[PDB]
Design a protein around this ligand. Structure first.
Ligand SMILES: Nc1nc2ccccc2cc1CCC(=O)NCC1CCCCC1
Length: 363
């Protein structure tokens, strides 16, 4: 899959994008890779932020679905006109599919000023597609229409970021050690179950049901590791107790200010439900994952949420992540490109014994 190695680019804090082509003749666009949404949506109008946009008038293969789509969120919106057209990934499988495309015609706080992407590829399942679950997501169309195996994997490496999206397979050069798999609880977001959290090896002794209130997802379209508040404060409570060589204001635990140089911070381990009854594994991240530079200087990349846990780039940049859709599971392995110092490396370890892992899920 050497074709697809290094097929992801971006800028710190602006997401990871892949090159795609839409229409005939092919129109090239940079498209954010997003495992926390399910719409393939592209700029279709000359927004001043945009390098380029989908020009439906130039495409002989374009078909109008004569239906609009309105997507409000926190805190912005995009909206557009639904159609289908021919889609390829130049540095992906050597195929071309007819996919749904939302031509974005109005937008608010969606596109980033200074970014190099013009659209978004929702890689999650139809249940969270807009307007409804009848709009077939891109990856579903891809798997149906070709012989591309029903999985993809992401190596996000982290001004310019790099990475790999391996479509239809796994490149073993992108990781070391073994992959460990956690069940996809339900096919809407990439939902998983966290069963135990350790700050510096120390348990948080919270009812594990709290770690998944009301869900926990894997999301390449989110920068931070995001935790339910009730879990977040207990997590912060421990993190700032483990960090007592220096002092930091309560505004920073959001965060606001920056440490600036020319070990005091604890490692973080999430235990995830395993493939076998009463069996789990753990993924361990460094401070060099939840301490992100802005523009030796760093910010605090863990924050609170009301929609559940979000395993974003903070988590994902330490690991090679396999979205094994065919077997309803997600694999984690230590990434070959993750950033480590001489004292600590990010880790994926198992098996561990954990009882009552079902009680950790919220219904
Ligand atoms: N991953 C993401 N991608 C996004 C892309 C555009 C606007 C908002 C986004 C938010 C997230 C965070 C995950 C999330 O809350 N997803 C729920 C809906 C939000 C509306 C779009 C479909 C998915």
């Amino acid at each position: 899959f050497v074709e697809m190695v290094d097929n992801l680019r971006g800028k710190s804090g602006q997401g990871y994008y892949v090159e795609m082509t839409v229409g005939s003749p092919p129109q090239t666009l940079n498209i954010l890779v997003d495992t926390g949404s399910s719409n393939f949506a592209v700029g279709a109008a000359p927004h001043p932020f945009l390098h380029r946009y989908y020009q439906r008038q130039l495409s002989s293969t374009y078909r109008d679905l004569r239906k609009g789509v309105y997507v409000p969120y926190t805190q912005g919106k995009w909206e557009g006109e639904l159609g289908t057209d021919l889609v390829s990934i130049p540095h992906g499988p050597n195929v071309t599919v007819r996919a749904n495309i939302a031509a974005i015609t109005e937008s608010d706080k969606f596109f980033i000023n200074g970014s190099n992407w013009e659209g978004i590829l929702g890689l999650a399942y139809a249940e969270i597609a807009r307007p409804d679950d009848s709009l077939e997501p891109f990856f579903d169309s891809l798997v149906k229409q070709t012989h591309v195996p029903n999985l993809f994997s992401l190596q996000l490496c982290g001004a310019s970021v790099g990475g790999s999206m391996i479509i239809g397979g796994i490149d073993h050069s992108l990781y070391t050690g073994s992959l460990w798999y956690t069940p996809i609880r339900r096919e809407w977001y990439y939902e998983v179950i966290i069963v135990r959290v350790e700050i510096n090896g120390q348990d948080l002794k919270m009812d594990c049901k709290e770690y998944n209130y009301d869900k926990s997802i894997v999301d390449s379209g989110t920068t931070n590791l995001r935790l339910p508040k009730k879990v977040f404060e207990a997590a912060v409570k421990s993190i700032k107790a483990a960090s007592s060589t220096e002092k930091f204001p309560d505004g920073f635990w959001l965060g606001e200010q920056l440490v600036c140089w020319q070990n005091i911070f604890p490692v973080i381990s999430l235990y995830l439900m395993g493939e076998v009854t009463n069996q789990s594994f753990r993924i361990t991240i460094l401070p060099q994952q939840y301490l992100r530079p802005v523009e030796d200087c760093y910010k605090f990349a863990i924050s609170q949420s009301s929609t559940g846990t979000v395993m974003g780039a903070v988590i994902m940049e330490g690991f090679y992540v396999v979205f094994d859709r065919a077997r309803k599971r997600i694999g984690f392995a230590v990434s070959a490109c993750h950033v480590h110092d001489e004292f600590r490396t990010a880790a994926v370890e198992g098996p561990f014994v954990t009882l009552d892992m079902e009680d950790c899920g919220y219904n």
